[PDB]
Design a protein around this nucleic acid. Sequence first.
DNA 1: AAAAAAAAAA
Length: 465
Amino acid sequence: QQSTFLFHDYETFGTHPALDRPAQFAAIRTDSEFNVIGEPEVFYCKPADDYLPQPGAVLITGITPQEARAKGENEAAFAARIHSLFTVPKTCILGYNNVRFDDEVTRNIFYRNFYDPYAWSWQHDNSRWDLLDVMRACYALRPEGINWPENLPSFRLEHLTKANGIEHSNAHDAMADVYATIAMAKLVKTRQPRLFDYLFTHRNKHKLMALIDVPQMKPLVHVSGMFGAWRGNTSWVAPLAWHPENRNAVIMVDLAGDISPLLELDSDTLRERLYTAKTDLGDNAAVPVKLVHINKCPVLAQANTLRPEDADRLGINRQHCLDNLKILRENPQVREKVVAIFAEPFTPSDNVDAQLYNGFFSDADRAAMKIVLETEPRNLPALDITFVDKRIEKLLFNYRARNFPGTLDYAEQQRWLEHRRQVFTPEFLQGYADELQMLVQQYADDKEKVALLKALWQYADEIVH
DNA sequence: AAAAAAAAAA
Ligand SMILES: [Zn+2]
């Protein structure tokens, strides 16, 4: 066995990994130096009878449900084959914006189809990585030897390829975006091996904790999209405390922001202000507090990694940062307040699709679920097992109804049909139809997009009648 | 060993 990178991409029918369903999946395997191993993979997913796609999404990808209905297979066979690629030992699974999007989709596909939601990402020396954050880090820290497009720097993949001399034909097709991803990976590793190798070696959470010192509030440069392009997605942060409820989260202070509220205000108002919209503040200062999830490949380094001139380029004032840090180190009651902001319960939906983060499944249940996968769908009803987790019973019905409709008996068929009738209410279809209509006018002068809106209208019409 | 449901990238 040898270490490889697996570049992957999804195209989905919507922006919500739990409720929306996937459409296309692509992947290429490569060695340490980015050379294709074997054949690229690209497949579709046959969307079930209880789902209509977001019009927005179909407009973006050009993939109609009929398209995926034809050349794709059920979500259970989709899941199974992505699973076998993802679980090849010593694989680093990566992509573009895959940590916040694609991996979430992956987790839910496994959850719905009885695979471990997470194992693919740690077991047999597996790991994940996000290339979007690397591009951003490169622009902030070591921009020399690459072109960065503007409008303010854009990190949309189609722009970064075009503005560097790489084929970018038919974007938002999965296979092409993987190729472009591979493209940016080679470039940066060539032009900036120092930063690239550093970033890769720091994808794992244990290396990152080596940088984080709560008691000293030792400052760090942090590149993250939430900081905004108007300052290169970069600032100097300090760790105040480990999040009281989430163990993979550290509470940072953005030293570039205004620390009046933290000194002045108390626990509750601050929480209110933090979740106050950027527009409803009036004159009030923003809370310069941000969570960093150490399992989500965040970009962190020692302060001096942002070099004097680079900080000059992005317009980050170092003196004002050092000013803030020194006041904070002398004002420990601030640790109290920021902890308190995050130390308050939550309610999930009664929809089992949206329940992955209810908690891990036990050993006993995995066994159970392992046996589910090993049973012929036609013998599932006869299977005599009991599950501890309330979720599993509910997932199993959905699995069966969505992937194996013919294995349902009469009463289960009647149950399913009631589900479908509860999804496709009159109020919902009107909302759906209203949206298509709106888009049809908004694109009256576009044959390509109206044909899609027509297609979506037809698919909706047949799937509910 | 694994998680958590403002800015800008999907
Ligand atoms: Zn894509």
